[PDB]
Amino acid sequence: DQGCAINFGKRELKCGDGIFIFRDSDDWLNKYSYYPEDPVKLASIVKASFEEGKCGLNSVDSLEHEMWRSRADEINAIFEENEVDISVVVQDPKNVYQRGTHPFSRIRNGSFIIDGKSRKECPFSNRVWNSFQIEEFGTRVYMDAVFEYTIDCDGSILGAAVNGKKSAHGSPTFWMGSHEVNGTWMIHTLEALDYKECEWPLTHTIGTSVEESEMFMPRSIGGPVSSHNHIPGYKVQTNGPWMQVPLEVKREACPGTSVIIDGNCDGRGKSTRSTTDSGKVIPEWCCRSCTMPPVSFHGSDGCWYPMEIRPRVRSWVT
Amino acid sequence: DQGCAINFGKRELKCGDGIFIFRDSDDWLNKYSYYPEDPVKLASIVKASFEEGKCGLNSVDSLEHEMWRSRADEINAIFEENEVDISVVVQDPKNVYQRGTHPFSRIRKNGSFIIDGKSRKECPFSNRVWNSFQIEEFGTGVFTTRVYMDAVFEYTIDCDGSILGAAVNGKKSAHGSPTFWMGSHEVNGTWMIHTLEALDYKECEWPLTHTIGTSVEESEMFMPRSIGGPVSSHNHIPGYKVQTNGPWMQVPLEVKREACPGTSVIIDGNCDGRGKSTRSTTDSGKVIPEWCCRSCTMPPVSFHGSDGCWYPMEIRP
Amino acid sequence: DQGCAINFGKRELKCGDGIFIFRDSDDWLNKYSYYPEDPVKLASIVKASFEEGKCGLNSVDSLEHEMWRSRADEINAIFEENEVDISVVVQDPKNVYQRGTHPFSRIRKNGSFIIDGKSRKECPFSNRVWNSFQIEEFGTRVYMDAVFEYTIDCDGSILGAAVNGKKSAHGSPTFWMGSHEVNGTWMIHTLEALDYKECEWPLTHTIGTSVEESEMFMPRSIGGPVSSHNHIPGYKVQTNGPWMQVPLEVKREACPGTSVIIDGNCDGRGKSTRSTTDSGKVIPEWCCRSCTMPPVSFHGSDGCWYPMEIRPRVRSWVT
Amino acid sequence: DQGCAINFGKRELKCGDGIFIFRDSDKYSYYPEDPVKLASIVKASFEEGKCGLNSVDSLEHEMWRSRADEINAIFEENEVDISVVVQDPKNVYQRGTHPFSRIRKNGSFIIDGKSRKECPFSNRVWNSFQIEEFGTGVFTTRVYMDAVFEYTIDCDGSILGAAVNGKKSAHGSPTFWMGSHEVNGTWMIHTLEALDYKECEWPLTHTIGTSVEESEMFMPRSIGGPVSSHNHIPGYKVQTNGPWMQVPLEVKREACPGTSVIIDGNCDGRGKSTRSTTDSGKVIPEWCCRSCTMPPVSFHGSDGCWYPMEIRP
């Protein structure tokens, strides 16, 4: 990794050798195509899995779903010669990639559904979720079908960095920037193009010296557990708007709403969308310990105030 | 943060945004003009500290030494202009620093105040100040790097985080420092050190908030925490246990995973081990072909210290 | 100038301070906002120059034409408020800025100061100001000060040149020429021209000025550097070249529909001829006298044009 | 080619293609032909009646100093009595007469030593090396040199550089940097540093504008300096007898301590350069010049101030 870097704040121009981390969480992953190793071998594994009765594989990353989208036309016509007749149909869940609990099985009008909905035939469970791994540098072919059921994200594409008082928790579809002010550490950026559920591996987190009930992004949704994951006056956002499209976290009150500090709110509560079902705006909002600048999101339906901003549509993560 | 990397040959140039930490910043040892707060208030603070019975000071980095070396003239000038008897003398320890006990004291013939050097029998290191400096900013020069420093009125055993750095990538990680660089990679399992340059013997503990991953205990860490080293799973080499007693108090080290000329590479499962870190050579500077290592790895680890090759506690005669 | 640079052949990553020349020969000239010296004064200058009796003002660079097209409205407002009644309208030549021979005049039925006017019969290319303008600094992004000094050489505040071993680059906002040295001699491997100027390269911005004419590839008149780096073996000067076209480019490759066979029975030098005839057919038969084995060809508006040395066994009238 | 500058404070960049030259790139590891063929060439040169060599630049001398021991070892292995020694001229390298010859009782082949009456420079080899490759490798800019058997009095053109811009220019080299700018008409030098003393002429194909006559060039031609209109300071003619034989120089536009210069139309001029002080370390504040400028120029070399030929005490 030979290169240069410029920091206009610190006006430094060091070059040479080292370690660099990038911010490729935006629309830049479509540049390089994804070629799984030995597509012929994958057909045998798919055929073996169908024997038990597994409904299908629900992907965990947008890259995984794009791999299936690209290979749908390239693998469906392959096994036609072998006369196996296992049709592959790819559904389109937008960004609500959920967790399944099953690994692959060993080699010993049917349709192999992928990302099937909550149909009565079988639930989200009884499906393969995260039984895959990258070979290297995730030209090259980088895919591996392993039988190791793990409840974390794959660590060959992730990253993290600290450069003094800065911070960064990089990921292909996730990014969290942190900085230190007045001693404690705070969050000032957070984006997520999807809704994963693999927990951040402990080998890529910075400063594991915190417990639960004090972070901002819970570890279930795929948030790092670190001292750099915290905002003053806010606890873990269990009932937050984490089931949405590409998000963003802003430290500002929303256009039409306002927050009035009080002391008779209903504890934690649950988050509420800015626009209620009744169509009437409610400027009455109360807070207990949060700072007077509220936190604002930017996703599918717009503003979703956190749990602590109570009035006087709801998150369904659990 | 608006930088990027290059790859000669394949002709790849991917540019974007992120966080960058470099290794060649550990090459320009003497390129910084350290600036304290001011000649006046610092002299007043050290005079106040000496007022309540303090022998002297003790440098914590290889930067504070040059700061005092460059500002001793101004300190003496302030002492002369203040008509004060106190004076400071700066000796030259090679690279070894030890632990003090007190910070700069509270505000409200020739004097002696040893900034750093051989500790006389007058008093132990207890009657000294060790860690009272905080870096608020790193560099404001257009291309060069001038360092400003702050005053701290409390005793903290941790280093200062304004100069550190630690980044991880795909099967790679590094913990940077102006006088230290640890490089790791993961092959067939866990992580392991493949490059480790140490240039001084500090004694400030690496902050807990700059360690990439705390899934490790104080049982199998190569560089000890007290010597100054990250408490992270990236800071170890398989087959070699904690180096609680090693050649960390020497000239710039270059830990290498190879043997040394004139030596023997044999692994013995019964020879004595886990004692001290004895010198590889003898008084005459000649090789001894009797080295043994315990449960180890085939490529031995050899230090490059003052006298040349050194061996860890896993290798004994 | 502080910065960093790379070299894919030398494998360098040096940084520091020095001199930098860039390849901003793209459509970056439209980003600069041209602010002449006190547009109120420019009205008086134009009024004077008109009173002494000069037809128009054929700009030399695309920057000047863009400046005039942008500031015609403001100058119109100025001499409409001040009651001067000398109408100024900006016409549009494609890229064929020619040479006029007059500097501005000294200070002290509608008037028509046509800018970049076509060669009409009302008055010739004379009575036209050509190059009485001078960039000030930092080539308001870019200023401009009027002068009264007739000049043939280009304006030196925007040009550039650099040699870094065996490489070369004669830069300009609307020009580029990347030279290289192989087997001792120097050649040309890149050439672009977004327009057709006629200001000569100044002798203070040419590298290795030690050669005469009859050995160049782009003559001085078209605005070509006078240097040993401006030369291709087997070709003399391109006096009768296709230099009156749109953005050009020189290629060391025969055009797809044609090929050239080395021979010794051609019809002298003559003049350049397009590959395609008037009727739309392509001529596949070409010959040569002393040119090198790989033929050269341009790519402008009408398409491929071969140099003077290639003949077939109303066109470009540069002369 | 894909590099760019910076605009600190304005926080903007202009990154693209072009040509870049630099000053403070400042290590080096020169590699000759090979330990064998070079040994054969120098052996043949000794056989044909050449006393020794003569280094031309601080690169060739360093290469010889580094590789003389290996050359002697190859000589011992091949059983030849020739031995080479690398004396140390301070920073002065002078001219030879002959190039290397084609391939096919302790003898002495001094690399660059004294001018003893043993033999003059006539029987010496001066410039017979060409740098085929430059830079590369791990930021060491390794340099590979190929023997050349023809006599030329021009420097090696693969390590030079010369750029011009809007009212700025610079002639570059690993041991030379002339910086010119244009103010109120003509060009003038505003920075000049020479870390060596060579006698190779600047190549004619790397001079930015040769509209100059060889009578108004500040740095002369034989000493090694660009032949260009950018190479002069107004009011000063050619310094043929200058303080050029020193360690790293710095042409500065200022007076000297304890000395003052007054333009006098009576005293003579155009002589030889003399130090501002004397052999006893005493300054002489009686300096006069003919046509000069208000700020005097002074070379800062080994001995400190030196005044050009237009200033006499």
Residue numbers in the entry:
A (entry chain b): 1 to 108, 130 to 159, 165 to 338, 346 to 351
B (entry chain B): 1 to 108, 129 to 337
C (entry chain a): 1 to 108, 129 to 159, 165 to 338, 346 to 351
D (entry chain A): 1 to 26, 31 to 108, 129 to 337
Question: Could you give the paper's own sentences about this structure?
Answer:
As the multifunctional protein within the Flaviviridae family, Non-structural protein 1 (NS1) is considered as a promising target against flaviviruses. Moreover, the sNS1 lipoprotein is involved in virion production, immune evasion, and multiple aspects of pathogenesis. The NS1 monomer has 352 amino acids, forms 2 α-helices and 20 β-strands, and contains 12 conserved cysteine residues that form 6 intramolecular disulfide bonds. The NS1 monomer consists of three distinct domains: a β-roll domain (residues 1–29, β1–2), a wing domain (residues 38–151, β4–7 and α1–2), and a β-ladder domain (residues 181–352, β10–20). β3, β8, and β9 are from a ‘‘connector’’ domain (residues 30–37 and 152–180) and connect the wing to the β-roll and β-ladder domains.
Here, we observed that the recombinant sNS1 dimer from a YFV 17D strain exists in multiple-oligomeric states, predominantly in the tetrameric form. The final reconstruction of 215,543 particles yielded a structure (named YFV_NS1_tetramer) at a 3.57 Å resolution. The structure of the YFV_NS1_tetramer presents an asymmetrical “H” shape, which consists of two NS1 dimers (Aa and Bb) stacked through the inner hydrophobic surfaces. The distance between the centroids of Monomer A and B (42.5 Å) is smaller than the distance of Monomer a and b (54.6 Å). Thus, Monomer B leans towards Monomer A, while Monomer b extends outward. The buried interface area between dimer Aa and Bb is 853.7 Å2 via a PISA calculation. The tetrameric structure showed that the interface between dimer Aa and Bb is mainly contributed by the hydrophobic residues from the β-roll domains and greasy fingers. However, the DENV2 and ZIKV tetramers have a buried interface of ~650–690 Å2, which is much smaller than the one we observed in the YFV tetramer. These observations also indicate that the YFV tetramer is in a conformation that is distinct from the loose tetramer and stable tetramer. Therefore, we define this structure as a “semi-stable” tetramer, which may represent the intermediated state between the stable tetramer and the loose tetramer. Moreover, we also found the YFV tetramer to have multiple conformations, suggesting that the assembly of the YFV tetramer is flexible and that it has the potential to shift between stable tetramer and loose tetramer states.
